[PDB]
Amino acid sequence: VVMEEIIKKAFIESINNIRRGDKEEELKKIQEKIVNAKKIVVATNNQKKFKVIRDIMLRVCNAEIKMLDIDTRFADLTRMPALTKGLIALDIEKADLYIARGRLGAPGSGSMLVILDEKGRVLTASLSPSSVIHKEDIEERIKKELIEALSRIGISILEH
Amino acid sequence: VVMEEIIKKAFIESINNIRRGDKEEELKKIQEKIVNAKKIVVATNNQKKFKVIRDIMLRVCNAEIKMLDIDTRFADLTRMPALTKGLIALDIEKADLYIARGRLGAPGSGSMLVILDEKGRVLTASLSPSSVIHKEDIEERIKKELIEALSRIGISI
Amino acid sequence: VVMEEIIKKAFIESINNIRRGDKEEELKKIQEKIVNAKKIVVATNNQKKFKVIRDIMLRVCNAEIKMLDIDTRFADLTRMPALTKGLIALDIEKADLYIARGRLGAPGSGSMLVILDEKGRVLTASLSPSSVIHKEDIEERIKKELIEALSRIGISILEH
Amino acid sequence: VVMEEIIKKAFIESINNIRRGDKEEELKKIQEKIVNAKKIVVATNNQKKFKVIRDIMLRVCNAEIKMLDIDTRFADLTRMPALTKGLIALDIEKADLYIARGRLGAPGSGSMLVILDEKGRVLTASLSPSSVIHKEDIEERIKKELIEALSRIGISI
Numbered sequence: 001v002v003m004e005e006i007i008k009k010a011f012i013e014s015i016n017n018i019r020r021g022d023k024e025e026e027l028k029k030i031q032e033k034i035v036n037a038k039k040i041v042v043a044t045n046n047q048k049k050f051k052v053i054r055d056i057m058l059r060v061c062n063a064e065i066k067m068l069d070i071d072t073r074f075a076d077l078t079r080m081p082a083l084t085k086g087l088i089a090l091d092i093e094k095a096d097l098y099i100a101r102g103r104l105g106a107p108g109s110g111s112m113l114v115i116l117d118e119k120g121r122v123l124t125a126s127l128s129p130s131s132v133i134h135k136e137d138i139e140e141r142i143k144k145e146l147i148e149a150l151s152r153i154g155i156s157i158l159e160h
Numbered sequence: 161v162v163m164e165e166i167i168k169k170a171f172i173e174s175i176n177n178i179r180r181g182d183k184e185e186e187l188k189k190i191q192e193k194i195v196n197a198k199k200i201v202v203a204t205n206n207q208k209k210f211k212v213i214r215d216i217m218l219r220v221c222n223a224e225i226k227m228l229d230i231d232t233r234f235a236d237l238t239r240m241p242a243l244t245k246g247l248i249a250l251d252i253e254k255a256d257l258y259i260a261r262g263r264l265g266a267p268g269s270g271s272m273l274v275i276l277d278e279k280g281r282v283l284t285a286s287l288s289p290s291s292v293i294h295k296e297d298i299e300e301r302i303k304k305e306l307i308e309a310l311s312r313i314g315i316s317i
Numbered sequence: 318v319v320m321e322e323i324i325k326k327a328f329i330e331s332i333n334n335i336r337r338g339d340k341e342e343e344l345k346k347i348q349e350k351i352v353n354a355k356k357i358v359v360a361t362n363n364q365k366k367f368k369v370i371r372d373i374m375l376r377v378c379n380a381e382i383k384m385l386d387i388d389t390r391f392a393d394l395t396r397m398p399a400l401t402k403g404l405i406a407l408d409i410e411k412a413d414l415y416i417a418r419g420r421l422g423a424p425g426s427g428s429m430l431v432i433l434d435e436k437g438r439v440l441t442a443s444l445s446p447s448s449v450i451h452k453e454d455i456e457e458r459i460k461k462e463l464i465e466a467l468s469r470i471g472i473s474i475l476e477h
Numbered sequence: 478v479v480m481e482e483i484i485k486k487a488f489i490e491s492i493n494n495i496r497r498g499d500k501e502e503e504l505k506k507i508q509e510k511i512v513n514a515k516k517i518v519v520a521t522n523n524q525k526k527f528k529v530i531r532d533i534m535l536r537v538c539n540a541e542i543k544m545l546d547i548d549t550r551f552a553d554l555t556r557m558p559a560l561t562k563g564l565i566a567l568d569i570e571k572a573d574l575y576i577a578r579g580r581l582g583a584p585g586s587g588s589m590l591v592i593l594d595e596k597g598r599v600l601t602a603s604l605s606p607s608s609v610i611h612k613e614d615i616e617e618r619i620k621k622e623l624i625e626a627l628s629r630i631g632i633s634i
């Protein structure tokens with residue numbers, strides 16, 4: 001069943017006041033979109049943030065993965081920089097998923113990593129404190145944010 | 161030093177390719193906005209949700225804390241329901257801080273708890289998976305979400 | 318050539334600070350999207366708005382055109398209700414274009430008619446005052462809105 | 478009565494499915510916020526957009542009026558740049574009214590002039606076609622946009 005249909009049903013539940021959380025069928029659909037993706041676009045500058053994310057994604061899918069270099073001055077004055085980044089990618093490349101990483105909200109708010117589908121829907125995301133608290137190397141943070149973003153919707157990065 | 165000024169300095173750092181992450185002064189300003197709020201709106205009309213959140217906030221600040229008048233479940237038809245719940249609150253009550261908890265994104269995407277300031281800025285947030293994964297009490301979950309949203313910007317219970 | 322590439326060119330003009338207005342290639346692409354649509358969804362439950370819109374759109378394209386079948390009234394709790402409606406249609410139906418009409422922003426701000434494509438981009442739009450001021454039948458207002466929305470991006474609705 | 482309270486009444490009409498169009502009381506409130514503004518910010522660092530808009534607003538109010546120190550061109554890669562510009566002004570400046578002018582949506586979609594209040598709500602707005610269609614100077618178009626935005630909410634010169 002198409003994604004549009006599963007979503008119309010969750011919306012009807014809410015109108016009729018009987019919506020009692022996320023459903024199994026919904027999680028399954030999000031899993032499918034991710035593992036069967038054919039094209040993925042990652043929004044970063046920097047050839048080594050790209051490498052951490054590409055090596056993790058090749059473990060869950062058989063997709064072509066392309067970097068896209070976003071002049072970030074055009075995202076970091078918006079209300080929600082990471083989310084802005086993914087949508088910039090959405091407008092200028094055809095793909096099945098878009099992954100981006102940046103400031104969550106107002107300055108001092110820390111990090112967000114987010115995954116969008118081909119219509120801009122937020123499928124999953126992950127968060128980190130300001131580096132002034134967690135004090136980890138940016139590469140190591142990206143790894144953890146990705147692994148948790150995949151696992152909270154049911155995709156394990158371990159051997160099957 | 162007022163919030164407008166701190167954000168201007170951060171914005172001009174980004175214009176000049178000098179921004180190297182969140183600064184000390186930015187964390188301290190957020191911390192202050194939260195511990196010094198005189199009025200907090202919880203963007204909900206479910207009494208269970210309201211109660212866990214009111215009781216926790218009462219340990220970090222000294223504010224009047226009220227729930228909303230109308231059902232925020234109608235936010236569940238937008239792209240980012242939790243976010244929408246905050247902005248609904250902001251439209252219909254004056255307050256220094258708005259707290260809202262709902263679905264993150266599309267159906268299946270789990271939870272988001274977010275804290276907004278009086279102009280709708282996003283100060284901090286935390287996320288959980290769908291409950292069919294974590295299998296916890298909703299009151300337990302809200303409790304862990306709020307504690308993490310505070311500790312990540314440097315407030316400890 | 319594809320919409321992603323045309324938008325990329327425009328984004329690279331802004332980055333390089335030589336973006337001195339919309340380009341003819343941009344207008345042509347938007348016209349083409351509208352003229353060649355096969356499926357259109359009108360994000361309304363009002364049979365009177367639907368009819369003005371369907372009778373006008375049939376003059377410029379040869380598409381299947383339908384309305385939305387869940388309640389749209391809850392859009393009126395959000396910041397930009399006409400927009401929200403278009404995005405609710407996007408999320409629950411497959412189509413090449415979405416057309417919505419509602420309140421512009423805050424209570425008292427009048428009406429917006431808006432047109433989105435399959436990825437949620439805003440292609441064109443038009444406004445009316447509150448009817449406390451303009452005082453006209455709704456059908457007449459819908460008609461004028463749609464006509465201006467189409468012609469400001471270069472689609473003539475007249476004889477020929 | 479305050480804006481929050483007028484907005485809550487309208488939201489309750491929608492929930493009970495009795496809302497129609499705009500109310501008289503709502504128009505008067507918006508009129509009153511604009512005519513009595515003490516501080517207006519024009520969301521731009523371009524002097525030419527600033528003068529046209531400053532000159533028109535002085536025909537309807539007695540506000541102090543300012544522009545910004547930073548360029549708002551950095552909004553032009555978002556989905557709705559004119560909106561984004563207004564929100565960038567709201568984040569770095571306290572005012573009663575914010576006025577912004579930019580692209581409506583996607584490239585080729587024309588222009589939008591938009592007015593926000595102190596919490597970011599959209600009060601009124603005006604659109605033009607791309608200039609390759611209308612062919613007029615930018616100072617003339619901005620002048621037309623602003624005059625229509627005020628008259629559509631009932632403020633005339």
Ligand SMILES: Cc1cc(OP(=O)(O)OC[C@H]2O[C@@H](n3cnc4c(=O)[nH]c(N)nc43)[C@H](O)[C@@H]2O)c(C)c(=O)[nH]1
Pocket residue numbers: 010019020021022236261262263264267268269270271288289290291295296297298301
């Ligand atoms: C993950 C998710 C949250 C959500 O919004 P909420 O207002 O937080 O939750 C609506 C209902 O969904 C169920 N639920 C949400 N979170 C939880 C949870 O963490 N543990 C349990 N047991 N149940 C939950 C409860 O019945 C809630 O009352 C909605 C509407 C959704 O579709 N998915």
Ligand SMILES: Cc1cc(OP(=O)(O)OC[C@H]2O[C@@H](n3cnc4c(=O)[nH]c(N)nc43)[C@H](O)[C@@H]2O)c(C)c(=O)[nH]1
Pocket residue numbers: 076101102103104107108109110111128130131136137138141179180181182
């Ligand atoms: C939290 C935050 C993130 C952010 O955007 P990003 O693209 O993720 O980071 C831009 C720079 O900000 C710093 N930074 C962000 N997160 C981290 C991190 O987790 N560890 C380290 N060492 N540094 C980081 C790095 O120097 C990056 O090169 C920006 C732009 C911001 O203001 N705050």
Ligand SMILES: Cc1cc(OP(=O)(O)OC[C@H]2O[C@@H](n3cnc4c(=O)[nH]c(N)nc43)[C@H](O)[C@@H]2O)c(C)c(=O)[nH]1
Pocket residue numbers: 336337338339553578579580581584585586587588606607608612613614615618619
């Ligand atoms: C319609 C449109 C507007 C727009 O942003 P703006 O800040 O309003 O204008 C950017 C440049 O686009 C040109 N422009 C915009 N509106 C006009 C106009 O009404 N008349 C003329 N002659 N030119 C205009 C000017 O060169 C502006 O400096 C952008 C960035 C865009 O891509 N399209």
Ligand SMILES: Cc1cc(OP(=O)(O)OC[C@H]2O[C@@H](n3cnc4c(=O)[nH]c(N)nc43)[C@H](O)[C@@H]2O)c(C)c(=O)[nH]1
Pocket residue numbers: 363393418419420421424425426427428445446447448452453454455458496497498499
């Ligand atoms: C200006 C405005 C519009 C609006 O939403 P809409 O879907 O555009 O219109 C809602 C109802 O308000 C009335 N109405 C709206 N626009 C018009 C109009 O232009 N002429 C007339 N006669 N009536 C109108 C009709 O009863 C509509 O069905 C809402 C919900 C609002 O609060 N304000």
Ligand SMILES: Nc1nc2c(ncn2[C@@H]2O[C@H](COP(=O)(O)OP(=O)(O)O)[C@@H](O)[C@H]2O)c(=O)[nH]1
Pocket residue numbers: 360361362363364365366389390418419497
């Ligand atoms: N009797 C009556 N019903 C109305 C009027 N305006 C709207 N309605 C009802 O409300 C429905 C929704 O219309 P509207 O909210 O404009 O549609 P939307 O564009 O889907 O939001 C209509 O189809 C009518 O049944 C009116 O003036 N009189």
Ligand SMILES: [Mg+2]
Pocket residue numbers: 389390
């Ligand atoms: Mg309606």
Ligand SMILES: [Mg+2]
Pocket residue numbers: 476477
């Ligand atoms: Mg003919």
